[PDB]
From Swiss-Prot, chain A:
Compartments in which it is found: Virion
This protein's name: Baseplate hub protein pb3
Signal peptide interval: none
Induction remarks: Expressed in the late phase of the viral replicative cycle.
Role played: Forms the simplified baseplate, together with the p132 collar protein, the baseplate tube protein p140 and distal tail protein pb9. Closes the tail tube and, upon infection, opens to form a channel thereby anchoring the tube to the outer membrane. These changes allow the tape measure protein pb2 to be expelled and phage DNA to be transferred to the host. Also forms the start of the central straight fiber, which is continued with the straight fiber protein pb4.
First and last residues shown, out of full length: 212 to 317 of 949
Organism (species): Escherichia phage T5
Subunit text: Homotrimer. Forms a pseudo-hexameric ring. Interacts with distal tail protein pb9 and straight fiber protein pb4.
Post-translational modification: Ubiquitinated by the Bil antiviral defense system when this protein is expressed in E.coli MG1655 strain expressing the Bil system.
From Swiss-Prot, chain B:
Entry PTM: Ubiquitinated by the Bil antiviral defense system when this protein is expressed in E.coli MG1655 strain expressing the Bil system.
Localization annotation: Virion
Source organism of this protein record: Escherichia phage T5 (Enterobacteria phage T5)
Subunit and interaction comment: Homotrimer. Forms a pseudo-hexameric ring. Interacts with distal tail protein pb9 and straight fiber protein pb4.
Domain of life according to the entry: Viruses
Protein induction: Expressed in the late phase of the viral replicative cycle.
Organism ancestry: Viruses, Duplodnaviria, Heunggongvirae, Uroviricota, Caudoviricetes
Residues of the whole record sequence present: 423 to 528 of 949
Protein known as: Baseplate hub protein pb3
Function: Forms the simplified baseplate, together with the p132 collar protein, the baseplate tube protein p140 and distal tail protein pb9. Closes the tail tube and, upon infection, opens to form a channel thereby anchoring the tube to the outer membrane. These changes allow the tape measure protein pb2 to be expelled and phage DNA to be transferred to the host. Also forms the start of the central straight fiber, which is continued with the straight fiber protein pb4.
UniProtKB/Swiss-Prot annotation, chains C, D:
Cellular component, GO annotation: virus tail; virus tail, baseplate
Induction text: Expressed in the late phase of the viral replicative cycle.
Name of the encoding gene: D16
Record's comment on post-translational modification: Ubiquitinated by the Bil antiviral defense system when this protein is expressed in E.coli MG1655 strain expressing the Bil system.
Localization per Swiss-Prot or TrEMBL: Virion
Function: Forms the simplified baseplate, together with the p132 collar protein, the baseplate tube protein p140 and distal tail protein pb9. Closes the tail tube and, upon infection, opens to form a channel thereby anchoring the tube to the outer membrane. These changes allow the tape measure protein pb2 to be expelled and phage DNA to be transferred to the host. Also forms the start of the central straight fiber, which is continued with the straight fiber protein pb4.
Protein's name according to its UniProt entry: Baseplate hub protein pb3
Amino acid sequence: TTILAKYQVKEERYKLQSKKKLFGLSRSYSLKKYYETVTKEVDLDFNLAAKFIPVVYGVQKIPGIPIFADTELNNPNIVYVVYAFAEGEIDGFLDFYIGDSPMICF
Amino acid sequence: INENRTEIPEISAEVQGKKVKVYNSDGTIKADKTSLNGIWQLMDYLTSDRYGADITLDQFPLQKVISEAKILDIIDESYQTSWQPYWRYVGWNDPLSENRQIVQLN
Amino acid sequence: RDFKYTPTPGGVVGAIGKNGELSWLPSLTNNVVYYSIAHSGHVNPYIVQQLENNPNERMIQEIIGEPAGLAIFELRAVDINGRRSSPVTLSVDLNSAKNLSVVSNFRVVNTASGDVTEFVGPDVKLAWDKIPEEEIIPEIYYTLEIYDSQDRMLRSVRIEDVYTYDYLLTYNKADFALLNSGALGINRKLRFRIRAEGENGEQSVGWATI
Amino acid sequence: RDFKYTPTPGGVVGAIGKNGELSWLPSLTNNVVYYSIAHSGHVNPYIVQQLENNPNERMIQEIIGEPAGLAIFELRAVDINGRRSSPVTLSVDLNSAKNLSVVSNFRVVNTASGDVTEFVGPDVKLAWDKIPEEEIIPEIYYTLEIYDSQDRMLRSVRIEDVYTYDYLLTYNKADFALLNSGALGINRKLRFRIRAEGENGEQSVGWATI
């Protein structure tokens, strides 16, 4: 994460999208509290629960947790970064969101 | 990284999900693709010692679970398959097929 | 990375009055927009836009017209957000320009009417206009060498503190007739060429000839 | 929007050596600061600052001096945050310039002393200096047409692979006396005018006359 932060904006320097956005509205929550608790991004420097590997059943969008990041020696502007998506034998990746825009347009 | 993409954007992906074991009434075992059925997903989560509780398949009546899965596999006739244009990204694999189960979970 | 200063070579076409050029490698930060190098004498810094980002390509900043002395540079990298990097300071003994300019308006005083390739007086008067770079380097002189009709050297005279020269009758009629042809005569057809030189500064870019 | 290339017209005052100009509409994004169009031959891209934002006004980028051939452009819009838009690529068969420069230093060799409007030799020698755009377009020639004292055309001669021409005595004394006045004579008073032309490139901006 620290190595990757060098090649990012000042914001989103140490951040990651929440794996699960909506979790379920029951009698344990109220409307205001339930819809205020839902978060979009979490800081990785103080959230050890954001480094757990999720498990996905069906087609769902999940963020990638970096586990390696390093550049080439004679080409320092070429950087290899490894993101661990999901757990177990998955069928495959349907699409990749490079930023907020998927490679395959809508 | 070059003159144009000066920063590494946040990477997210749309996975298809972990493959699950779908038990059939006759006795054969089919685990080649992920399943949207809730009972099979719960059975995968409950019989995995890597993530979750390690409940062996011995402590499970296969016939009852198979019969209860078909309850969630009942075809719904309220809507038409043509009405979903994002068929590939809602868990379906072939628009020609039925894909109209009463309860489908991603 | 690798902030250095490279003095200009001895003699090259063009590059008149150019001191050494400053070179550096691009910052490893990839969102830098430009660099602000601050010369000591100049009130405003040079702004060098980074338009093409190749880490293994040297960026340059040339100096033209700065007199020799103590020059202190400070190089910074500027982001898109406006944050500046820690400056890189280089103090180098700046050299004197070694690619001077050609003497201008090298014309012959006392010239014949109608046709200009003909003399009118016994002594040819050589007038030239000042070289522009006199201001930058004070210790500069002019080497005026006069040739013959048969492409044989005759005179090599240095002119200093004056932008004009005359070729006395006595000289041609006695000294350069005797020492060369061992006799009395006056070479009627001559060729004059002149250039600028300094004690430490080097020659002009090219010869200035009639 | 609407990235196009418009070749320059045939003949217009000024615009010497100018190829076609590139035009585009401003990006609908309102926080774009400038545009970075990258020509194939040039190492650095053109930076066009967007200072006035009117969506229905075309921005321009002219090309001066690029030789005809295969030119590929890529146009991007740059934000304040540094994000670049998806490039717009246009490959157009770039034309040859059609607004050439005037011939320079069109002077008469063998000219009379004292007064320059008088001949000195039997054959007038016409010397001209090279047009600057020779390098860009190789297939260029000069159309030298000579007129009379009474504003009557005499000669129309094309000069190629040479920057000089002579007007032989035989020509004037026989050919152009006989074919025009049906007799023997030599038009003493003449008018010479010349311009540059190419097989595909068009005429010079204006006539170069004595």
